[PDB]
């Protein structure tokens, strides 16, 4: 299959969901704090209006997928392998489902952009964002932007 997406699936086991977009997984037999590619999850911000504290929601959704997954896989992109603090920046599958998408598809994330290179599914995340926007999901239930949502 000829594709722009010439990446590589790799195994990970859930150790500890750190954030909505940061997760310690076992990779190659060692714990590493992974980073959800193309994902922008909110921290525990304001409990009123705007970009609310949709952090536990995001984190627990990520956590959900990763704890629920018996198989977590990752796929390192062509940009970078490490983000934030050198977290492991990669595509992430949880029981085969894409965490990144699912987080931004849930309305617990926005489409980010990490590094020039790793954005091979950014289209999908922006689409999932916009999907969550159009349906108005979690963050998108807020008037934080209202310029696409």
From Swiss-Prot:
The cofactor named in the record is:
Ca(2+)
Localization recorded for this chain is:
Secreted
Q: What is the superkingdom listed in this entry's lineage?
A: Bacteria
Q: Does the keyword Nuclease apply?
A: yes
First-listed, main subcellular location of the protein, grouped into a coarse class: secreted
- Is Calcium among this UniProt entry's keywords? yes
The molecular function terms in GO held by this entry are:
endonuclease activity, active with either ribo- or deoxyribonucleic acids and producing 3'-phosphomonoesters; metal ion binding; nucleic acid binding
**GO cellular component annotations of the record:** extracellular region
Cofactor binding note? Binds 1 Ca(2+) ion per subunit.
Q: Where does Ca(2+) bind?
A: 21, 40-41
Q: Which UniProt keywords apply?
A: Calcium, Endonuclease, Hydrolase, Metal-binding, Nuclease, Secreted, Signal, Zymogen
The free-text function statement in the UniProt record for this protein reads: Enzyme that catalyzes the hydrolysis of both DNA and RNA at the 5' position of the phosphodiester bond.
Which family is it part of?
Belongs to the thermonuclease family.
Q: What is this protein called?
A: Thermonuclease
**Shown stretch of the complete protein:** 80 to 228 of 228
């Amino acid at each position: 299959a000829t594709s722009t997406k010439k990446l590589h699936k790799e195994p990970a086991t859930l150790i500890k969901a750190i954030d909505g977009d940061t997760v310690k997984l076992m990779y190659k037999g060692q714990p590493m704090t992974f980073r959800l590619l193309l994902v922008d999850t909110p921290e525990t911000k304001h409990p009123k209006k705007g970009v609310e504290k949709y952090g536990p929601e995001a984190s627990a959704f990520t956590k959900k997928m990763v704890e629920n997954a018996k198989k977590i896989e990752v796929e390192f992109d062509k940009g970078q392998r490490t983000d934030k603090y050198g977290r492991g920046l990669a595509y992430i599958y949880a029981d085969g489902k894409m965490v990144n998408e699912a987080l931004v598809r849930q309305g617990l994330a926005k489409v980010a952009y990490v590094y020039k290179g790793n954005n091979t599914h950014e289209q999908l995340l922006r689409k999932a964002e916009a999907q969550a926007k159009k349906e108005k999901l979690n963050i998108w239930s807020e008037d934080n932007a209202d310029s696409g949502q």
